[PDB]
């Protein structure tokens, strides 16, 4: 597992494993 | 934006873990 690209979908998944139960903000710059 | 530093750039278990509160 090395640094890579990931947005929302696969992005929170990563946020999930890293923390997951800690909950993240995952803001969307629209 | 955070989904850009990862989707528009690179993000590791630390960059996305730095987003989980």
Q: Which of A1, A30, A27 is nearest to A12 (CA)?
A: A27
Of A6, A18, A19, the CB nearest to B7: A6
Experimental method: NMR
Is the dihedral angle over the CA atoms B19, A21, B14, A11 positive or is it negative? Answer: negative
Cβ pair B19:A15 closer than 8 A: yes
Q: What is d(CA A1, CA B13) in angstroms, rounded to the nearest whole number? A: 9
Task: Measure in Å the smallest separation between the Cα of B18 and chain A Cα atoms.
Answer: 9
Task: Measure in Å the smallest separation between the Cα of A6 and chain B Cα atoms.
Answer: 5
Contact B3, A5 (CB under 8 A): no
φ and ψ at A23, to 5 degrees?
70, 135
Q: Encoding tokens for residue A15?
A: 């946020």
Q: Encoding tokens for residue A16?
A: 């999930």
């Amino acid at each position: 597992f090395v640094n890579q690209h990931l947005c929302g979908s696969d992005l929170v998944e990563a946020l999930y494993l890293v923390c997951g139960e800690r909950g993240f903000f995952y803001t969307k710059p629209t | 934006g955070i989904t850009e530093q990862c989707c528009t750039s690179i993000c590791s278990l630390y960059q996305l873990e730095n987003y989980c509160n």
